[PDB]
């Protein structure tokens, strides 16, 4: 019995749209008192400045100590330099949670912000929980939940979708979909989106079966990289991180590989290599699964 | 450099469907003790009367002081007079939140109500938070969240969608998607829906670019109405309210106009007028009008 090398490939669109500056407007909210929306200012609690007249700030509540709570979204127009890259994390802007103590009952329960641009409007939704404040400061934190909304739009006759991924502490890698913020504090996060082809956003992916071409069977080991000398044990059905993405390979040989990397991180001639290792006799054999990760253009798709 | 006058057009279906009386049934819930559903009665906490045998009331909890908490939905069959108008706010009924103090732990966490009519069924979903009661009465309020669900159905060979908009205090214009109700209180709200053509509900809309026929360019001003004598400054990328809907016009001339008005409020020969001011590379400004015909059509098209 002999395991035979397996090959596969996956295309990732690597390309960009030309886009305008983006413009954010808080359009709707539910509940709350003293609710205002406005274009950001350098007033103390004004949210800072942006290049447009969209109302990027929202505030609520009668302050009990200083300022009103709310949200603000400062776009990333400068650094985006007129471009959206495909299959690439995009910082659309920086979202700040202003949590101050307001008299109880005065806060919204939800709100929606539009982000418009020319190539389109992405709608964002937020659930808000201004928690009753107690002596326990962690329990007193206020909580935001952002939806994973999206918008599909047409370009040169094909569909693209822009999709909300979530919030990120700058300089970190973790995306969250809920934020917790202490009272009398602000919390700023990158708002991360991605755009790609089709009617929803989906990470590029490919699937196969490594046992299909083997000679005699059960997969009993898998790993990133080339480990043929040793063979491999375990990790069957676990997520296996490679250079550009993740592999899951099941005991019956079926696998899915998913490209998670930013397109910018994927060179030309990019190949992802895995190793897998048993037949009914109990004899083992090891081989490689080699996957091309091909950079292609919108046109070539 | 000279800004030229623009013309656009958006079509709003203005027609009506013949429909039966609607019938509401609470079909499912999660958690809670002593949960009952029933057709409303004039018992004190019975919810009032409706013309049908659907179970329009739901109750829960062991009362600590008087009555059980719950929800009730009294249809609007009488005033709807057998008709659903398109692109027109529809009061499907009145939703009442009965919040009483019940022994802790006794309330549902969620529930679902069917509304059937001729055979079409709209499903409504509710998340429920019967909050632990304290000395803080605002924190002690119980909170309801309604989903923006919908149903698509066929008529004379074309698709229509009925869509939940949310809750409204009668005689006000504000829709909310969450309700907060004090303990030992009831809270009644109109439940607002809309129906229109297609597979989801969407406000009628049109898009364009005002700089496309300009002669030489950045839009530096926009406003509702005719302000050509003065020219206009600011509001580029803001939501601009007109008579029948809202305009957003970006600095590169791209715009979207969206009809929010009830069809009933839109006359024949309806026109929406905006003014914009453009600036060229020399720094010279010019002002013109964007005139958008809001045309009442029929389902026939």
């Amino acid at each position: 019995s002999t395991a035979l090398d397996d090959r596969g490939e996956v295309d990732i669109v690597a390309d960009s749209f030309t886009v305008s500056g983006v413009v954010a407007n808080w359009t709707s909210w539910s509940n709350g008192t003293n609710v205002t929306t406005f274009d950001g200012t350098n007033a103390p609690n004004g949210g800072g400045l942006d290049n447009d007249s969209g109302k990027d700030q929202i505030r609520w509540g009668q302050p009990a100590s200083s300022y009103s709570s709310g949200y603000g979204f400062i776009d990333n127009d400068s650094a985006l330099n007129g471009e959206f890259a495909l299959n690439q994390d995009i910082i659309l802007g920086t979202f700040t949670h202003y949590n101050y103590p307001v008299y109880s009952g005065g806060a919204i329960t939800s709100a929606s912000m539009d982000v418009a641009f020319s190539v389109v409007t992405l709608k964002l939704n937020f659930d808000h929980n201004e928690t009753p404040n107690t002596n326990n400061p962690e329990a007193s934190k206020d909580i935001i939940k952002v939806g994973n909304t999206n918008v599909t739009f047409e370009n040169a006759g094909a569909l693209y979708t822009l999709q909300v991924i979530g919030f990120r502490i700058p300089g970190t890698n973790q995306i969250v979909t809920e934020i917790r913020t202490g009272e009398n504090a602000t919390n700023s996060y990158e708002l991360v989106v991605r755009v790609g082809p089709g009617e929803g956003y989906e990470l590029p992916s490919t699937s196969g079966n490594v046992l299909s071409n083997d000679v005699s069977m059960t997969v009993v080991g898998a790993a990133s990289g080339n480990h043929v000398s040793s063979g491999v044990s375990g990790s069957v059905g676990s997520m296996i991180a490679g250079l550009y993405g993740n592999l899951i390979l099941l005991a019956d040989g079926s696998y899915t590989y998913q490209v998670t990397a930013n397109a910018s991180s994927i060179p030309n001639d990019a190949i992802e290599i895995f190793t897998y290792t048993k037949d009914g006799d109990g004899d083992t054999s090891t081989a490689l699964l080699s996957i091309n990760v091909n950079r292609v253009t919108m046109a070539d798709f | 450099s000279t800004a030229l006058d623009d013309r656009g057009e958006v079509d709003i279906v203005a027609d009506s469907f013949t429909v039966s009386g609607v019938v509401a049934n609470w079909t499912s819930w999660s958690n809670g003790t002593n949960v009952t559903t029933f057709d409303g009665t004039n018992a004190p906490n019975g919810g009032g009367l409706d013309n049908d045998s659907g179970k329009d009331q739901i109750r829960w909890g062991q009362p600590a002081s008087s009555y059980s908490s719950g929800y009730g939905f009294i249809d609007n069959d009488s005033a709807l007079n057998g008709e659903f108008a398109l692109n027109q706010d529809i009061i499907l009924g009145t939703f009442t939140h009965y919040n009483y103090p019940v022994y802790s732990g006794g309330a549902i966490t969620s529930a679902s109500m069917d509304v059937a009519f001729s055979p079409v069924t709209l499903k409504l979903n509710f998340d429920h938070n019967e909050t632990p009661n304290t000395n803080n009465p605002e924190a002690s309020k119980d909170i309801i969240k309604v989903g923006n669900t919908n149903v698509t159905f066929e008529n004379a060979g074309a698709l229509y969608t009925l869509q939940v908009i949310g809750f409204r205090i009668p005689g006000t214009n504000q829709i909310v998607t969450e309700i907060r109700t004090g303990e030992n209180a009831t809270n009644s709200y109109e439940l607002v829906v809309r129906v229109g053509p297609g597979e989801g509900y969407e406000l009628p809309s049109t898009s364009g670019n005002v700089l496309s026929n300009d002669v030489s360019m950045t839009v530096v001003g926009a406003a509702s109405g005719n302000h050509v004598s003065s020219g206009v400054s600011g509001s580029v990328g803001s939501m601009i309210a007109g008579l029948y809907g809202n305009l957003i016009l970006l600095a590169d001339g791209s715009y979207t106009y969206q009809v929010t008005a009830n069809a009933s409020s839109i006359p024949n020969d309806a026109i929406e007028i905006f003014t914009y001011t453009m600036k060229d590379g020399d720094g010279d400004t010019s002002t013109a009008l964007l005139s958008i015909n809001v045309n009442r059509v029929t389902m026939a098209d």
Partner: peptide, 5 residues
Amino acid sequence: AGWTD
């Protein structure tokens, strides 16, 4: 009391 959220 002047409870806050």
